[PDB]
Enzyme design. Structure first.
Site, PDB file in Angstrom:
ATOM      1  CD  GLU B 357      -2.702  -1.356  -0.036  1.00 20.16           C
ATOM      2  OE1 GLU B 357      -3.312  -0.370  -0.495  1.00 20.16           O
ATOM      3  OE2 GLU B 357      -2.731  -2.481  -0.575  1.00 20.16           O
ATOM      4  CG  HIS B 487     -12.983  -9.993 -10.306  1.00 16.16           C
ATOM      5  ND1 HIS B 487     -12.749 -10.784  -9.202  1.00 16.16           N
ATOM      6  CD2 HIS B 487     -12.105  -8.966 -10.225  1.00 16.16           C
ATOM      7  CE1 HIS B 487     -11.776 -10.256  -8.483  1.00 16.16           C
ATOM      8  NE2 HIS B 487     -11.367  -9.153  -9.082  1.00 16.16           N
TER       9      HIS B 487
END
Ligand SMILES: *[C@@H]1O[C@H](CO)[C@@H](O[C@@H]2O[C@H](CO)[C@@H](O[C@@H]3O[C@H](CO[C@H]4O[C@H](CO)[C@@H](O)[C@H](O)[C@@H]4O)[C@@H](O)[C@H](O[C@H]4O[C@H](CO)[C@@H](O)[C@H](O)[C@@H]4O[C@H]4O[C@H](CO)[C@@H](O)[C@H](O)[C@@H]4O)[C@@H]3O)[C@H](O)[C@H]2NC(C)=O)[C@H](O)[C@H]1NC(C)=O
Ligand SMILES: *[C@@H]1O[C@H](CO)[C@@H](O[C@@H]2O[C@H](CO)[C@@H](O)[C@H](O)[C@H]2NC(C)=O)[C@H](O)[C@H]1NC(C)=O
Ligand SMILES: *[C@@H]1O[C@H](CO)[C@@H](O[C@@H]2O[C@H](CO)[C@@H](O)[C@H](O)[C@H]2NC(C)=O)[C@H](O)[C@H]1NC(C)=O
Ligand SMILES: *[C@@H]1O[C@H](CO)[C@@H](O[C@@H]2O[C@H](CO)[C@@H](O)[C@H](O)[C@H]2NC(C)=O)[C@H](O)[C@H]1NC(C)=O
Ligand code: NAG
Ligand code: NAG
Lengths: 170, 698
Positions: B357, B487
């Site tokens: 991150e 997805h």
């Protein structure tokens, strides 16, 4: 170099700045040198050390609250929205530019939208001239105002934080 | 005057009015995500509504500037981004129908339940309940129940929604002057380079086909090794030559093989790297983890974290009564505001996720100087590739040894590197055929190369041929097995995960070459490399101002995607797998199934539509009931749903097999079904007005 120029509670917007004429002799410049609160104290035409003994006919002080990334535009000799449509400095500049962060006074959590800048003008500004006229300009097929307001938030980076800029002119 | 000046004015006004709305929307989203309440939903909805209305309107004005009369590249790219996405040409009822279909698919995926065969009141959701079984269980029949209850109680609900969704999305993409929705998804990789022809949308398909061809041998050897190790566990369920059953791959869809590591580990007596105890000791908190990540990024020359990052980011779960989303995300709020929202535990996984991150945040502040349209990755894979290559450099045992988390008495033998490379390959190499095959299936579904009556047939053909995975239960057109993935049911493109790995290992090889590393590529650390950080910052500084081909050529020296760094990374593992797979069979056949050996082939000799097939299934169920009542003195309520039909020619032939009620893993022996057919042949052959010669029953 006076206290009321740098310690004013309300500062002017960049499109309509405040020019103060100084013609006194009380100028020690030691507070400006040793304050260590100015983010920018770089200037031209003087060495910023032989300023105490040299005298001038008049001193002009300006005041704007430009963003952090357009403090460099207040220098002479480059483009930018502030340098073109707002306050513009001549190539031969014999004064000094001082700037400091003002996040504690000009930024809020919900946003401070009280400071305006000119986004477009018909022609580029000549050095040391000001325009305050509220007019609309054409983008696409719509008419909207040429003055856009700064969005000053407390949780913003240093490039998007308010900066009180005081420009001396000798 | 000239259209360049008008476009520049329009872009300046759009940027000035766009950072405002983007920052307000990001602040509302942050206030919801760090403080979950019904009051914070409405603020985010209002801010997103204003931003979306502004974006579609400004795209409508942006369509009025012709792209052929613009000479500046930056204005051209900004106007291309503005014109590509906007308000569709869809009518209001069709757009409402598309939104309702998408909401229904997301709600079905998030709220679908699968109930136990013995306990109707024990119904399990996917995320806490079925995922635990699919990731931890070593039982064939429990995993088969979890795999078959899903895609039957959920995928069968998503089949007509997906059928309408394909048509609506293809119409919407044809309104944007594209061939289909797949072309609209492939528009991300399209560039117009100044020198020579640029990257096209068909070139992406050609490139991913070439990359899959290049990765096929390593995946074949990994598949053979996993099959040989998954023969020990689950005996008499895996063929030594055939494909791997879909419900024994570590998750629901076989996307990652990482949960197969306890079953497929080489050198199990060698402990793996786990420094979590060493940070339970020495007083490590989340602040220490993120400070060490910042120190690592400073060591290569990248900037420090900003002062607002340390004040505004939520690095820990709040101690007060504030509900948060515990998903590690890096936020680019706008106006120089970078935050990380993650619930950091003192774990190695949290350490590497913090580095990931922080790499995202470093990319964000690197391209923060670009205009607002160009403040993104070069394509959709670059952000995640940068995050994973930072995580790759950090996770080396040398870095943990100089960090103090690893004792100096730890010695790196050849057995530990094999374990590390195999654990990496179960997440990296095992996910590439699945990603490629799913994106391929979606592309030819959107293109129309797969008709609506061959969706499951083509899905389980390419699953056998490409992934080497066989279904345990035959699936007809009532099923929608791709839609059981998150997805596919939530309208997310999948090729970014494919391109991320290739770009990540290309960047890893380039930065390890710049850092003057001399050993194997998996033992490389780019710490204290100011040249590698300089090249990486030159990459990350240009967000979307130029083509991704030019940025890739700037960092790795190549204009194209190359999987050679990926194969060079896994070369010792490839050599070890080649040495191990000498007594095993490498490759698979697409003919073996778990139900294949016990199925009876039925030839039709002469209107045999679905109603006659239902009548045949009912006749077979009745014959099963009669045989089990009159032979074993057992009553078992066989139904038409217990007769499974495979290899269905339209009017020629098909194969069938029978499973038990309440147990889909209990395939009835073929001799028993043959005896049931020969016991009650008269009723079966009288139900269709024919003799025993026409139905061969071989
Ligand atoms: C980012 O998003 C924020 C969201 O808040 C947005 O801030 C808002 O900006 C607008 C536009 O500048 C502000 O509205 C202007 O405000 C003043 C009057 O505001 C007073 O009252 C409000 C109460 O609502 C208070 O919040 C505020 O503090 C003040 O006390 C006026 O300058 C403006 O009126 C002029 O523009 C209108 C546009 O249609 C005209 O209808 C109106 O008549 C005025 O124009 C005329 O003015 C003169 C009339 O004699 C004349 O000389 C002129 O030529 C011209 O004809 C306007 O209402 C609004 O207050 C802000 N909201 C806040 C602070 O909460 C930012 O604009 C946005 N930033 C960007 C870059 O998009
Ligand atoms: C979390 O959200 C709640 C709302 O759900 C916030 O409570 C609000 O606080 C403001 C500011 O004092 C009040 O005007 C509202 O009336 C409050 N709403 C409710 C429903 O009580 C709360 O402050 C937030 N917490 C944090 C730490 O930001
Ligand atoms: C290179 O990075 C490493 C860590 O990857 C640093 O190595 C340690 O740094 C500390 C703090 O200066 C020293 O006390 C240790 O002796 C160093 N070595 C080891 C093996 O732990 C190193 O400082 C970085 N290089 C430079 C020039 O700063
Ligand atoms: C469902 O059927 C399977 C297969 O018949 C049962 O699992 C085991 O199957 C093996 C042969 O594959 C037999 O030797 C065992 O006796 C079976 N049972 C056990 C407990 O191991 C399975 O038990 C059946 N039931 C459930 C609830 O899954
Ligand atoms: C980053 O921050 C650390 C800790 O405050 C400081 O010592 C270091 O000089 C900073 N690095 C840069 C490049 O500013
Ligand atoms: C961050 O928080 C500290 C501690 O409250 C404060 O002193 C500092 O000014 C803050 N920095 C910002 C808001 O940039």
């Amino acid at each position: 170099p006076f206290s009321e120029v740098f310690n004013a509670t309300t500062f002017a917007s960049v499109y309509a700045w405040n020019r103060k004429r100084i013609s006194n002799c009380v100028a020690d410049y030691s507070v400006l040198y040793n304050s260590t609160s100015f983010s920018t104290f770089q200037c031209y035409g003087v060495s910023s050390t032989k300023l105490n003994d040299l005298c001038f006919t008049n001193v002009y002080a300006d005041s704007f609250v430009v963003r952090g990334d357009e403090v460099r535009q207040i220098a002479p000799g480059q483009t930018g929205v502030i340098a073109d449509y707002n306050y513009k400095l001549p190539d031969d500049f014999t004064g000094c530019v001082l700037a400091w962060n003002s996040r504690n006074q000009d930024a809020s959590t919900s946003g401070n939208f009280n400071y305006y800048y000119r986004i477009w003008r018909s022609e580029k500004l000549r050095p040391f001239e000001r325009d305050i006229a509220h007019y609309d300009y054409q983008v696409g097929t719509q008419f909207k105002s040429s003055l856009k307001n700064y969005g000053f938030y407390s949780s913003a980076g240093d490039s998007h934080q308010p900066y009180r800029v005081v420009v001396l002119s000798f | 005057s000239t259209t360049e000046d008008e476009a520049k004015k329009f872009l300046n006004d759009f940027n000035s009015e766009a950072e405002n709305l983007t920052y307000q929307s990001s602040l509302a989203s942050w206030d919801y995500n760090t403080n979950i309440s019904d009051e914070n939903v409405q603020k985010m909805d209002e801010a997103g509504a204003k931003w979306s209305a502004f974006y579609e309107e400004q795209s409508k004005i942006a369509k009025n500037y012709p792209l052929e009369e613009i000479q500046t590249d930056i204005v051209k790219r900004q106007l291309q981004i503005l014109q590509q996405s906007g308000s569709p040409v869809l009518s209001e009822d069709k757009s409402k129908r598309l939104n309702s279909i998408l909401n229904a698919m997301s709600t079905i995926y998030s709220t679908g339940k699968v109930c136990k065969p013995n306990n109707p009141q024990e119904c399990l959701l996917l995320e806490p309940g079925l995922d635990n079984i699919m990731g931890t269980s070593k039982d064939y029949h429990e995993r088969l129940w979890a795999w078959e209850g899903w895609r039957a109680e959920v995928g069968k609900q998503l089949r007509p929604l997906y059928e309408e969704y394909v048509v609506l999305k293809n119409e919407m993409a044809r309104g944007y002057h594209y061939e289909d929705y797949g072309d609209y998804w492939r528009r991300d990789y399209e560039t117009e380079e100044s020198s020579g022809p640029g990257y096209s949308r068909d070139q992406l398909m050609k490139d991913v086909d070439r990359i899959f061809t290049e990765i096929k041998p390593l995946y074949e050897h990994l598949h053979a090794y996993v099959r040989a190790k998954l023969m020990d566990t689950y005996p008499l369920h895996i063929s030594p030559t055939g494909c791997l059953p879909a419900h024994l791959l570590g998750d629901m869809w076989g996307r990652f093989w990482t949960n197969l590591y306890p079953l497929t580990v080489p050198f199990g007596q060698k402990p793996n790297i786990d420094v979590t105890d060493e940070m339970v000791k020495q007083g490590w908190d989340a602040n220490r983890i993120f400070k060490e990540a910042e120190k690592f990024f400073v060591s290569v020359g990248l900037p420090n974290m900003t002062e607002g990052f340390w004040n505004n980011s939520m690095l820990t779960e709040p101690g007060d009564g504030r509900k948060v989303v515990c998903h590690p995300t890096a936020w680019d709020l706008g106006k120089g505001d970078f935050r990380i929202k993650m619930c950091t535990k003192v774990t190695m996984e949290d350490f590497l996720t913090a580095h990931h991150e922080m790499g995202h945040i470093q990319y964000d502040m690197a391209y923060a100087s670009q205009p607002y349209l160009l403040r993104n990755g070069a394509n959709e894979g670059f952000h995640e590739a940068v995050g994973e290559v930072m995580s790759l450099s950090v996770a080396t045992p040398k870095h943990l040894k100089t960090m103090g988390l690893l004792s100096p008495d730890f010695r790196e033998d050849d057995e530990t590197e094999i374990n590390f490379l195999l654990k990496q390959a179960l997440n990296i190499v095992g996910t590439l055929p699945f990603t490629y095959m799913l994106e391929k299936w979606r592309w030819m579904v959107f293109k129309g190369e797969i008709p609506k009556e061959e969706w499951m047939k083509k899905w389980w053909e390419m699953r056998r041929e490409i992934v080497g995975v066989v279904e345990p239960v035959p699936h007809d057109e009532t099923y929608c097995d791709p839609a059981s993935l998150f997805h596919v049911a939530n309208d997310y493109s999948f090729i970014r995960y494919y391109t991320r790995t290739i770009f990540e290992f290309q960047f890893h090889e380039a930065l390890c070459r710049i850092a003057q590393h001399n050993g194997p590529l998996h033992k490389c650390d780019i710490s204290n490399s100011t040249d590698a950080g300089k090249k990486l910052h030159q990459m990350l500084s240009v967000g979307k101002s130029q083509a991704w081909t030019k940025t890739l050529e700037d960092i790795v020296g190549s204009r194209n995607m190359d999987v050679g760094p990926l194969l060079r990374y896994f070369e010792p593992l490839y050599t070890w797998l080649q040495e191990q797979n000498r007594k095993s069979y490498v490759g698979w056949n697409t003919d073996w199934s778990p139900y294949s050996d016990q199925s009876i082939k039925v030839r039709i000799s002469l209107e045999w539509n679905d109603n006659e097939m239902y009548l045949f299934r009912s006749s077979v169920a009745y014959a099963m009931r009669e045989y089990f009542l009159k032979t074993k003195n057992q009553t078992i309520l066989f139904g038409d749903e217990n007769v499974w039909v495979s290899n269905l020619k339209p009017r020629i032939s098909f194969n069938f097999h029978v499973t038990s009620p309440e147990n889909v893993s209990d395939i009835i022996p073929r001799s028993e079904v043959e005896g049931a057919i020969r016991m009650s042949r008269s009723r079966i052959n009288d139900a269709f007005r024919l003799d025993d010669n026409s139905l061969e029953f071989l």
